[PDB]
Design a protein around this ligand. Structure first.
Ligand code: DGD
Ligand code: CLA
Ligand code: CLA
Ligand code: CLA
Ligand code: CLA
Ligand code: CLA
Ligand code: CLA
Ligand code: CLA
Ligand code: CLA
Ligand code: 8CT
Ligand code: SF4
Lengths: 163, 32, 107, 61, 41, 31, 80, 733
């Protein structure tokens, strides 16, 4: 299909790749009589591993010749051809994960800025003031636009330069 | 190749002799 | 002569339980190069109960040291003259630690 | 000219406080080349928190 | 208790405590929801 | 297969390219 | 011989002159200073290049700046 | 000045050996001497170019002459595939009976070097087929070079010494170098192709004897002058055409069929004859652009000065640049290396995939030894393009006349450029390494199914536009419908779609997950190399720490351990750090090129795209298998024919490892050590009588780093030069 790939469920080497692991695993657990937890621990992993195979085959990942599932970047490809969960969705997740801690770091420096000596306030955090920021940081996309358009996000031209 | 005796003549001259002279003369010119 | 030494055991999560090697005695864990097992045989330690008794006793006397550490700085701290006695200190370390500590072990 | 305690911005090209606010600790009434003395909460590379400037450079805000 | 808090508010303490709250959480998310390659569920 | 005669012709021809450098390098360093 | 030159910015703190291990910088009296004192470098001969001067200047950007020139028997500090 | 460094009296008088060391390394810097006027500075330069230009020719006449004399040619010409080209013989007084014999591999009697240079085919695909031709050719370059050493001597005398403003006339050079140097040469070269190479490709011997008795084409110039130009293109060769003979040989001269020449698996010659003949016509037209004595043309400056955009986004735009450029040499040299540097690489990108010469991509190891040459030699040239970019800003840049220019706008924002390169280089830093590590762990714990693998979508779709049909796309040349395939269907599509779809030739190798992850490392290496160099240029003037660097010199050790202990504060030390990255981002390339090809030369695509993702395959597969052949050279059981490289590969490390002694251990330690020795030698008996003139001293700060980075590179090159050659010479792909 896409890019000369095939869905991993209808792949073949992928099916080798799944059923070659259990063999090497089970031939190993034949050395432990069931009265041993190692007989159970190995068993539980073989059943744990097969779950993910039926998951990867189902979810529709694309395995190339090797049988290993690949991904696809472009929105116009992921979206239209149906699998965007590889990056396109989690690339939104991350930004909200990263910007949240990103923007929660900016407010704290603002709130702790005006004082007698902000320095000791950076070493020793007052967690309540940091908590009020961790709370306030949520919905940073809407709070970033506003510091952006109100003009309070940038520090403008009093920055220092050299020559 | 018909010239075969040349390398035995040159290589020692260019691997030793010239580096012997260019070692001496280039030295004496460092201090005057 | 067969079983290889092992202590550390790896929790199953994150697909890392493969680190547990098939070793011996129906067990899965990391190899040991430290050499505790081949000491504990030479100390005449057989059951697991001797080990718990050292673990606790070792962890108990450890707590006695930090109290000694607290006690000899904050509470009762020797003076300079006390640390200036080498010949006492050397009589004791050489006889007390090494002299008695060898007999005790020779016993 | 400029007065003590009032905030300042510094346009001196070579400086660690160039375009950075500072508070005058003292201004001399004299003919000194560099009469005004400012003070900055920030620290220089040298560890210097104070410096003398010229009237042409210091500007009060 | 005054001064015990201020110490617990030092930089390396929170750096330890708060990462060990992520680390633990991110570890256990993988305990119940194992092997998450793509967001498909 | 190159004739032994040609060989010395070339080596002598490259011998002149040794003097024209010495004449250059002098005049250049002498400046 | 190294070059050392001094600028308007001096406060006359003498903190340079105390630094020089060869005692190059020597305080010359002056007028426009707050303390009415200015350093100066009569010997560019014996500046070794330590730049212990430039570390000592309390001035924001230095009143002394050592410009390393060529290096002689003295300015290499040779015992040989 | 009496003593050795005659050109500077600061060095001329030094009691120590630093007079000696700098005397060598300060030589070629002509802006710094006793008194160098503007006129006499251009003099020594323009004389020196005669030096470089003459040195090259002799170097070529050597290659020609040796192959003509100590090497085999005819025997190779007969069997290009099944026999090895030979280079100069191995003369060592040091050998045993075994190593002599083991190195006599070839057609010759004595021990010789199989020549991996690659020059040996470019003679045959131009075509010669006698050792006489090589000797005949090796004499000219000896003669011709003699003309410059004459010219070099000839232009330094007062009479023929050219005036300064002769050098600064930039509209005459361009007109000449474009049309005369570039263009006219391209004519002559198609002249050579049509008259010599192409007929000799079909097995017709033409030399300076029979040259003008034999038509290159059956027609005359009738078709050329009537205006009818499809005759020359009318009768191309056959697919089964056998090279250097006449079998089904087409009659055409100027054609292009695209694709290769399946016997030689190289480019069609008529296709090249058509090429240069077009380039000849372009330059010759483009050399009349700039004005000369005849008053018709353009003025360089009044082209520029009208380009300030009518907004002010660029402010004054290009204004007084033709001042800075035509005055600053280093500015002109920064462009020269940057322009020529990239092309060196561009050569290497095309020349493996489009193997112009006949019967390369057959013998493999002469591609590897080349592609790496032109990547490294392209690396150094760019790192020098930025250095002289810094020497520009540190010295001959003027902020006054440039006020509001485009150069001054960049210095106005230094950080933006510096800061964003610092973001891109970190992004590629964490994520590219972060994936290799993730892929490693997943394959360590035994499930590769968990790996992060991304398919390089774009460069796949780019190859789809190119028309590689292995993918599912069909846009432009891939789709027979698109208004592209229909346009070129008549000319270069039919051939060039065979070469791209016949997965033997390396044209557009199929890409994949390993291909994806590497191109980001490559992309990483390009940014952090620029990030360093772009910094050293913009901070050459000054930074917040030391804003004197404009007046403190260019290359200086430091400002001393004040105000935070400045070290490497200069702009030379900034460049100094680029080389270390230059040698990675080139090392990553030349690795990634080698081991993608190894699998393809060895007939398997699965060694790479399987194990290419995780970093162990690079170590476990590419490094481990290749090393087995190299280390057996010096084997105590006997000498292999790779024992040459087995030794050097060790010589490569020991220099690299020596290089750390200079980079790590700094001076003050060694200066106190020499003190103890100059005391011992001084007060010891029988050595009292023998003493030094120049008092020994631990060499200068900057001197060591320079010496240090030399060892680092010389060692970095010889290992990979030995590993590459002796891996493909041991296996033969
Ligand atoms: C190509 C080699 C030929 C073929 C090989 C032959 C074997 C090589 C044997 C080595 C022979 C040379 C050894 C040189 C060591 C000395 C280097 C040194 O102390 O040199 C340091 C000098 C010292 O700097 C100069 O130092 C000068 C010192 O001042 C002097 O100059 C002042 C300027 O007027 C005044 O005159 C003053 O009186 C006087 O003191 C000034 O400071 C100059 O401004 C400053 O530039 O630095 C310089 O200028 C730097 C100039 C070098 C830049 C090139 C560096 C490139 C690094 C190599 C790249 C890796 C290559 C690996 C290749 C591997 C593949 C095979
Ligand atoms: C560097 C930027 C970049 C590049 C080069 C591409 C490249 C591409 N995009 Mg994409 N895109 C991008 C950024 C980019 N995207 C961003 C930021 C957005 C915003 C959401 C989009 C939104 C987008 C849409 C909505 C569409 C594309 C489409 C395409 C394709 C365009 C047609 C083509 O090239 O042949 C087409 C490519 C192939 C035939 C090869 C398919 C490759 C397989 C599926 C993997 C191509 C794969 C179009 C598409 O899907 O093309 C089919 C399409 O409809 N893109
Ligand atoms: C939370 C505060 C904060 C914020 C808002 C930023 C924001 C920024 N940094 Mg940054 N940085 C920070 C902390 C922060 N940084 C710290 C603590 C360090 C190291 C000690 C750095 C080191 C750093 C470098 C070296 C670079 C940046 C860059 C950047 C810019 C691009 C973003 C990026 O890719 O960074 C990527 C971030 C990193 C590589 C490291 C960040 C590591 C985390 C985020 C620091 C921990 C945050 C802190 C614990 C939050 C406490 C919250 C609590 C008190 C309430 C952006 C302006 C880049 C730049 O200028 O490009 C424009 C750049 O080159 N920063
Ligand atoms: C028989 C008498 C005796 C003994 C056994 C020791 C034993 C020891 N002394 Mg010591 N000491 C003594 C007399 C003695 N001292 C006297 C009289 C002086 C005065 C000059 C000192 C002054 C002195 C100094 C200044 C230092 C020591 C240190 C040490 C320890 C050696 C470091 C080490 O590896 O320990 C190995 C540890 C073990 C083998 C574990 C056994 C430890 C247990 C608790 C036995 C300790 C007995 C000890 C005598 C205390 C008993 C009295 C107390 C319980 C009331 C060791 C515990 C060093 C040390 O560790 O400081 C804390 C050290 O720096 N001693
Ligand atoms: C230094 C440590 C140490 C300690 C704590 C002991 C402790 C003991 N030994 Mg002993 N022993 C030691 C070293 C030690 N030994 C050494 C170094 C030797 C070699 C000479 C012996 C040789 C020895 C013999 C031959 C016997 C003991 C016996 C005994 C036990 C009875 C002793 C008794 O009644 O004393 C009064 C309080 C007692 C548990 C006796 C035993 O085990 O009971 C039959 C016994 O017959 N010991
Ligand atoms: C920088 C590159 C990079 C990237 C993109 C990833 C990405 C990933 N790694 Mg990975 N890894 C990396 C570097 C990287 N890693 C490195 C450098 C190492 C070596 C230390 C590893 C070692 C590693 C292991 C050993 C494992 C992963 C796993 C994973 C996947 C699971 C993510 C997860 O926990 O679910 C997402 C988790 C959450 C969403 C929890 C957050 C929940 C909050 C509450 C949501 C709140 C929203 C409001 C994910 C695709 C795991 C896996 O299964 O991969 C196949 C796994 O077992 N990685
Ligand atoms: C037609 C007239 C003409 C011609 C032929 C030349 C020719 C030359 N001049 Mg020149 N000059 C002229 C007029 C001319 N000039 C005039 C009128 C002036 C006064 C304004 C000057 C002023 C002048 C100066 C001041 C200097 C020169 C220099 C040079 C030399 C440059 C080095 C060189 O050849 O690069 C070799 C490069 C090529 C032959 C082509 C390179 C093209 C690109 C880079 C690559 C293309 C090749 C191909 C793709 C690669 C494959 C190669 C193959 C082996 C595989 C060259 C001999 C310089 C020199 O060397 O000093 C003598 C120099 O310093 N000239
Ligand atoms: C045509 C290209 C070209 C030209 C004309 C110049 C010209 C110049 N460069 Mg320059 N440069 C170039 C390319 C070029 N460079 C490239 C490609 C780089 C990057 C590597 C540099 C990096 C560079 C730096 C960093 C500096 C210069 C400097 C200079 C000036 C003085 C050079 C000097 O003193 O050398 C004199 C001769 C030597 C120093 C010879 C030293 C030998 C070197 C170290 C190589 C040793 C390794 C050797 C090959 C190993 C042999 C292996 C074997 C034993 C097995 C001069 C204007 C210097 C300058 O202007 O400072 C003010 C300076 O500091 N250049
Ligand atoms: C393998 C060795 C190595 C590595 C990894 C780096 C990495 C880096 N160099 Mg560097 N460098 C090196 C060798 C190396 N260099 C050498 C030999 C030289 C010659 C002197 C230089 C010279 C040099 C210069 C001159 C410059 C750099 C720059 C950079 C940065 C480029 C951006 C990047 O890729 O970030 C990727 C970053 C990483 C891969 C760091 C990985 C560490 C992980 C992600 C975090 C820690 C892991 C773990 C949590 C630690 C646990 C520890 C334990 C106590 C808990 C980066 C930090 C440039 C820079 O500043 O960039 C902004 C720059 O200007 N370097
Ligand atoms: C730092 C320094 C000191 C002071 C002055 C100085 C100018 C020297 C300054 C600059 C130094 C240097 C070396 C700067 C830049 C170096 C570099 C990396 C130059 C490379 C530029 C690359 C360029 C354009 C590529 C442009 C686009 C290309 C090919 C592709 C075109 C095309 C595409 C993409 C598809 C095929 C067909 C078509 C349309 C032709
Ligand atoms: S130079 Fe710096 S230190 Fe020496 S006197 Fe002037 S100000 Fe005080």
């Amino acid at each position: 299909d896409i890019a000369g790939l095939t869905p991993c469920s209808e792949s073949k080497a992928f099916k080798r790749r799944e059923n070659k692991e259990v063999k090497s695993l089970q031939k190993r657990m034949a050395k432990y009589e069931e009265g041993s937890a190692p007989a159970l621990a190995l068993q539980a992993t073989a059943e744990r591993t097969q779950k993910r195979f039926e998951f990867y085959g189902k979810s529709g990942l694309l395995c190339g010749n090797d049988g290993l599932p690949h991904l696809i970047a472009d929105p116009g490809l992921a979206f239209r051809y149906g699998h965007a969960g590889d990056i396109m969705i989690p690339t939104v997740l991350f930004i909200y994960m990263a910007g949240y801690t990103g923007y929660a770091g900016r407010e704290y420096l603002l709130a702790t800025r005006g004082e007698k000596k902000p320095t000791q306030k950076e070493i020793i955090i007052d967690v309540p003031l940091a908590l009020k920021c961790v709370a306030g940081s949520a919905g940073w996309p809407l709070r970033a636009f506003n510091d952006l358009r109100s003009g309070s996000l940038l520090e403008k031209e009093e920055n220092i330069t050299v020559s | 190749m018909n010239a075969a005796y040349l390398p035995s003549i040159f290589v020692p001259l260019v691997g030793l002799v010239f580096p012997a002279i260019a070692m001496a003369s280039a030295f004496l010119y460092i201090e005057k | 002569t067969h079983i290889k030494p092992s202590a550390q055991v790896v929790w199953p999560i994150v697909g890392q339980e493969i680190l547990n090697g098939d070793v011996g005695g129906g067990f899965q864990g990391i190899q040991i190069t430290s050499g505790f097992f081949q000491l504990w045989r030479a100390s005449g330690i057989t059951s697991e109960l001797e080990l718990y008794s050292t673990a606790l006793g070792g962890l108990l006397l450890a707590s006695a040291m930090f109290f000694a550490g607290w006690f000899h700085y904050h509470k009762a701290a020797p003076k300079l003259e006390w640390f200036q006695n080498v010949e006492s200190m050397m009589n004791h370390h050489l006889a007390g630690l090494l002299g008695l500590g060898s007999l005790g072990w020779a016993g | 000219g400029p007065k003590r305690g009032s905030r300042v911005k510094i346009l001196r090209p070579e400086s660690y406080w160039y375009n950075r606010a500072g508070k005058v600790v003292s201004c001399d009434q004299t003919g000194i080349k560099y009469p005004v003395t400012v003070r900055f909460e920030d620290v220089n590379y040298a560890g210097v928190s104070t410096n003398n400037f010229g009237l042409q450079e210091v500007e009060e805000l | 208790m005054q001064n015990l808090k201020i110490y617990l508010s030092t930089a390396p303490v929170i750096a330890f405590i708060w990462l060990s709250l992520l680390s633990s959480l991110i570890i256990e998310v993988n305990r119940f929801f194992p092997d998450p390659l793509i967001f498909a569920f | 297969s190159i004739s032994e005669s040609q060989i010395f012709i070339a080596i002598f021809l490259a011998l002149i390219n040794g003097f024209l450098a010495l004449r250059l390098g002098s005049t250049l360093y002498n400046s | 011989s190294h070059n050392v030159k001094i600028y308007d910015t001096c406060i006359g703190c003498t903190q340079c002159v105390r630094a020089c291990p060869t005692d190059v910088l020597e305080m010359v009296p002056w007028d426009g200073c707050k303390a009415k004192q200015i350093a100066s470098a009569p010997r560019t001969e014996d500046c070794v290049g330590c730049k212990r001067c430039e570390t000592a200047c309390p001035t924001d950007f230095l009143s002394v700046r050592v410009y390393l020139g060529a290096e002689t028997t003295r300015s290499m500090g040779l015992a040989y | 000045a009496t003593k050795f460094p005659k050109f500077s009296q600061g060095l001329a008088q030094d009691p120590t050996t630093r007079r000696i060391w700098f005397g060598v390394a300060t030589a070629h810097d002509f802006e710094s001497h006793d008194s160098i006027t503007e006129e006499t500075l251009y003099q020594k330069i323009f004389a020196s170019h005669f030096g470089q230009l003459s040195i090259i020719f002799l170097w070529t006449s050597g290659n020609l002459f040796h192959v003509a004399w100590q090497g085999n040619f005819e025997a190779w010409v007969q069997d290009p595939l099944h026999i090895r080209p030979i280079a100069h013989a191995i003369w060592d007084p040091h050998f045993g009976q075994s190593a002599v014999e083991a190195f006599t591999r070839g057609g010759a009697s004595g021990p010789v070097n199989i020549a991996t240079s690659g020059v040996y085919q470019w003679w045959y695909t131009i075509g010669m087929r006698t050792n006489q031709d090589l000797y005949q050719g090796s004499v000219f370059l000896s003669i011709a070079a003699g003309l410059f050493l004459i010219a070099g001597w000839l232009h330094l005398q007062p009479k023929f010494q050219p005036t300064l403003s002769w050098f600064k006339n930039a509209e005459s050079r361009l007109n000449h170098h474009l049309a005369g140097l570039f263009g006219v040469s391209s004519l002559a070269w198609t002249g050579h192709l049509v008259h010599v190479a192409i007929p000799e490709s079909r097995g017709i011997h033409v030399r300076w004897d029979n040259f003008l008795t034999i038509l290159p084409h059956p027609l005359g110039l009738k078709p050329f002058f009537t205006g009818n130009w499809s005759a020359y293109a009318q009768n191309p060769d056959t697919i089964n055409h056998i090279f250097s003979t006449n079998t089904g040989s087409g009659d055409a001269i100027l054609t292009f069929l695209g694709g290769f020449h399946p016997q030689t698996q190289s480019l069609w010659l008529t296709d090249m004859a058509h090429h240069h003949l077009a380039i000849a016509v372009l330059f010759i037209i483009a050399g009349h652009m700039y004005r000369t004595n005849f008053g018709i043309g353009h003025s360089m400056k009044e082209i520029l000065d009208m380009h300030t955009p009518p907004s002010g986004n660029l402010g004054a735009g290009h204004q007084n640049l033709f001042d800075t450029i035509n005055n600053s040499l280093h500015f002109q040299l920064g462009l020269a290396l940057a322009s020529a540097g990239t092309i060196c690489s561009m050569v290497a990108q095309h020349m493996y995939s489009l193997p112009a010469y006949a019967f390369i991509a057959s013998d493999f190891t002469t591609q590897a030894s080349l592609y790496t040459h032109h990547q490294y030699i392209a690396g150094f040239m760019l790192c020098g393009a930025f250095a002289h970019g810094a020497i520009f800003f540190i010295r001959d840049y003027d902020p006054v006349a440039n006020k509001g220019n485009v150069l001054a706008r960049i210095l106005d924002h230094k950080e933006a450029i510096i800061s964003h390169l610092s973001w891109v280089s970190l992004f590629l830093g964490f994520h590219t390494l972060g994936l290799y590590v993730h892929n490693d762990v997943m394959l360590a714990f035994g499930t590769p199914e968990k790996q992060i693998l991304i398919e390089p979508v774009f460069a796949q779709w780019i190859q789809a536009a190119q028309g590689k049909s292995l993918y599912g796309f069909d846009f432009l040349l891939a789709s027979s419908t698109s208004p592209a395939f229909n346009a070129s269907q008549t000319v270069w599509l039919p051939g060039w779609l065979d070469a791209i779809n016949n997965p033997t030739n390396s044209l557009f190798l199929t890409i994949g997950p390993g291909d994806f992850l590497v191109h980001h490392a490559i992309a990483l290496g390009l940014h952090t190399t620029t990030l360093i160099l772009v910094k050293g240029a913009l901070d050459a003037r000054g930074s917040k720490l030391m804003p004197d660097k404009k007046d403190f010199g260019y290359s200086f050790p430091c400002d001393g351990p004040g105000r935070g202990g400045t070290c490497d504060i200069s702009a030379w030390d900034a460049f100094y750090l680029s080389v270390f990255w230059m040698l990675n981002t080139i090392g990553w390339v030349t690795f990634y090129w080698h081991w993608k090809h190894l699998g393809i030369w060895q007939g398997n695509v699965n060694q790479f795209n399987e194990s290419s993702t995780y970093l162990m395959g690079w170590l476990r597969d590419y490094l481990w298998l290749n090393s087995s052949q190299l280390i057996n050279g010096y084997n105590p059981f006997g000498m292999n024919s790779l024992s040459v490289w087995a030794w050097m590969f060790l010589f490569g490390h020991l220099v690299y490892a020596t290089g750390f002694m200079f980079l790590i251990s700094w001076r003050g330690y060694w200066q106190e050590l020499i003190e103890t020795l100059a005391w011992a030698h001084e007060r010891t008996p029988l050595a009292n009588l023998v003493r030094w003139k120049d008092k020994p001293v631990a060499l200068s700060i900057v001197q060591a780093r320079l010496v240090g980075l030399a060892h680092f590179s010389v060692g970095y090159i010889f290992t990979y030069a030995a590993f590459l050659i002796a891996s493909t010479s041991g296996k033969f792909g």
